[PDB]
Write a protein that binds this DNA or RNA. Sequence first.
DNA 1: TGCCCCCCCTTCGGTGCTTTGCACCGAAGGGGGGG
Lengths: 406, 553
Amino acid sequence: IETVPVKLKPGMDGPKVKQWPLTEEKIKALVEICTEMEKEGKISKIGPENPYNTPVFAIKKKDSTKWRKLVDFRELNKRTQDFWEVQLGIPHPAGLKQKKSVTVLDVGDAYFSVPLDKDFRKYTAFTIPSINNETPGIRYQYNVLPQGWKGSPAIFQSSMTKILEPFRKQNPDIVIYQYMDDLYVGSDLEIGQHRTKIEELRQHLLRWGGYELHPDKWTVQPIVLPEKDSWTVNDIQKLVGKLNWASQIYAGIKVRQLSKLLRGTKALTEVVPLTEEAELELAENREILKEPVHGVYYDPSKDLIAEIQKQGQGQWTYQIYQEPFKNLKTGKYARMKGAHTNDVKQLTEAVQKIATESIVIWGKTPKFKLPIQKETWEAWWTEYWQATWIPEWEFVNTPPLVKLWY
Amino acid sequence: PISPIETVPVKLKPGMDGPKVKQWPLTEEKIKALVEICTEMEKEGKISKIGPENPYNTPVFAIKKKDSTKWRKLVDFRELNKRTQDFWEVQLGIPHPAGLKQKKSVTVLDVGDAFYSVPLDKDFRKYTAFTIPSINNETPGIRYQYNVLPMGWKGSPAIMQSSMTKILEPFRKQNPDIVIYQYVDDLYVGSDLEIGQHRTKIEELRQHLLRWGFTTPDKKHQKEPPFLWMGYELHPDKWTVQPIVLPEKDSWTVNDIQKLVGKLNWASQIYAGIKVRQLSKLLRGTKALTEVVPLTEEAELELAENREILKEPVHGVYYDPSKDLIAEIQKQGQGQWTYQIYQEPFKNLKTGKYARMKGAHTNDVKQLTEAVQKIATESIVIWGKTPKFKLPIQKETWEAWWTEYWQATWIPEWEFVNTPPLVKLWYQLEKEPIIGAETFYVDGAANRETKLGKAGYVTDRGRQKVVPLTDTTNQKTELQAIHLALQDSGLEVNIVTDSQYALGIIQAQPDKSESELVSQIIEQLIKKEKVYLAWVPAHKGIGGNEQVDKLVS
DNA sequence: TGCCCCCCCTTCGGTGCTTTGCACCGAAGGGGGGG
Ligand SMILES: Nc1ccn([C@H]2C[C@H](O)[C@@H](COP(=O)(O)OP(=O)(O)OP(=O)(O)O)O2)c(=O)n1
Ligand SMILES: [Mg+2]
């Protein structure tokens, strides 16, 4: 086979990111995985004259004990040429989010049968660490299409189309979407019959070389206003501030007639009766918050952003947007683990499910704004990661002024 | 001898040429010591004479090595390093004796002149050129180039370490129950073999190293305990640090105090309770390493406390995989924490301290969380797992924190330990407004151009006040308005601000701050009995807020 | 008059916010220690 010429973006150098510490069980797994890969010639031992590096770690699913090497190519992918500039990119089918159930298959192994541009391999170096720094780090670079590199689905796109089309030929009602190392395969068949054509799909690929999602249960939870039969000054101030915020998102929401219900310097716990002109204002605003906001459309040329808020008792709210206050989706994630003692685990799982939904719906993951300290996240998150991809993220600290999304 | 190992190819950075710097003129007496050094290297083929075609140069010098009769050669490759290609360093960290297991038989070997036994890429050697001036620059002088890794070149440490790893790799796989710690050129070799077969394996390792050109002189071959290793002393059942000697001085300069703090930090890995906050405070706001700083009273006390700790002897122990790791943290005051890591009681593997101020405003629970995170990371590095924790915070306290704090926050499985002072939240904010409590509507504004502002309030009980402020900011006036409302109210208060900046700081329950003003607010919240704190949007005619806003204007 | 690595404490300067200072964070200075 002939390699495809690959370039970084103009004026950019390759990744130079330090390896972070790994536990014993993860180091063992990398060493087993990488030495078998070196024997098969998929990676090559290198030295320090290669100035590039990318962090590596390992993730084990609850369902399958078998470890899975995971390289953080997030930096490399940002500096790699677009394959929409060369038009070798693969589109997303808008018929996936409609499906009854969607299974996710890890097809990363198909990439290991295609060589990578000799001049590009050096950008893929990684380093395995040493318990108690007993030895210096051990370095490899890839010789084939790496798992996690954004260029592998693009280079191997054509090969993927021809392997699948018999299956697509024979099941026109099923939709398959590649996203990096993953296949998202959705159908409308019964819960147990759906699974068997999943296993039929497997062995067609196995011949050459997680769990069921359910999209039509991805309920949108909107902005709600409390209802009591008594209203304190504090209740009306908290409601006026909450709608004054929502007027940046919705249209035609007014506070003039609940505002001067609070005319004067009143005590916070004094019970104020509602004007008729105030129930007029409130019952109306309640249903602008009912159904979604007119005029918000997805734009594939812009990035997706996700904000999450911790709400307590295991619940987490989130919003996905591209322009501020023009949400394409608002939701609430709940924890069914039952441990009820981990906040980082919950957030880590929340980012995977939110990201999964954006893949199914729009075909790419959003950049997350995470409600956690950088160093708390980095102490623990890899303990709970189960996806073969990793989204972009940043860390924010904004207290609630409103509890807008409760 | 020079290793027959393949060289590692190296490049200059793109667009750059080689160094070209005149060697600083030196005396004829040192010049032929120079001459002496290169003549003998030339007989081992470590360097070769060159001439005027090679247009590059770089200057040379030497420093006394602690040997009785040995010297270290060095060449000032500062300029070549700048033009040499970037390297990915393979030394990722420093091995620690608390990470070693008990071994029946132990050896420590060192390779002799490791760098000079590793060859340098042929196409690169011409950039290592150096001149020894002859006849006080009357003649061109002798010129050499390196054929091996020069000391002082940016790439020499990595290429040497990398070369040693490939040479050791066959021997490691051949016999997997021999521990070899490899640090640059220093080899610790442990095993559970009787000292007979051990020494067979040792001689066999030495012969393997020598076929690749790495000598192991008897002088650096340690065969009996206590072993000198990485700055420590290894005993069969325990380990100690080599003696720490702190400066004793009548008058202290900034640079003296800098050395003292570093020594104490180094000691803190095994001596429990070391503190440096008051000594380091003397370095703030200084302007010269030679500036004389008088010790404060608190610094003398802290120094004296550390000196008492250091005159006791102490030891770490080695690691037993068959047992849990336990980490216990104590609180020491002013944002300082100290910890011990052990497996059986009163037998520390190591100790440590955590004392960083992250953020302008924080509290003890956050900082405890940060210490836990530092210890967690250190443990993964040394032992490859995290420990079980013993912490002086009650389950009620922690649970009150991760519910009323809006950021995700978790600490690993731990056990409460009653060792005062305990870590506690110093006040909590009421979730709902307090019946019968006064209601304060606070506001502050400042003019950015004039840096003049006001802070005031109005009240449901009819109270009002306005204070002029000079040389302040927008955010300070808002903090100031909350400051006064807490000052003039009772034990129970309801407060309404329009500054989510102020709400953001205070809702986080800080107990310490780099700001005197925020510190003042903390002291007042701690005195109170109940506080409810409410936000409203500004400039929307909301009863209370608009009254106080008008008053401030 | 040199090189590489880890650690801590201080200081400085860039980023972004529906800002006009502020808080955050990474890099570079100093020190310890290893080779
Ligand atoms: N001040 C120092 C000390 C060490 N090293 C590097 C070069 C050395 O080759 C190597 C190891 O130093 P050693 O103290 O072990 O002594 P040498 O290897 O130089 O000579 P020998 O071991 O034969 O006495 O680390 C350095 O560059 N500068
Ligand atoms: Mg040596």
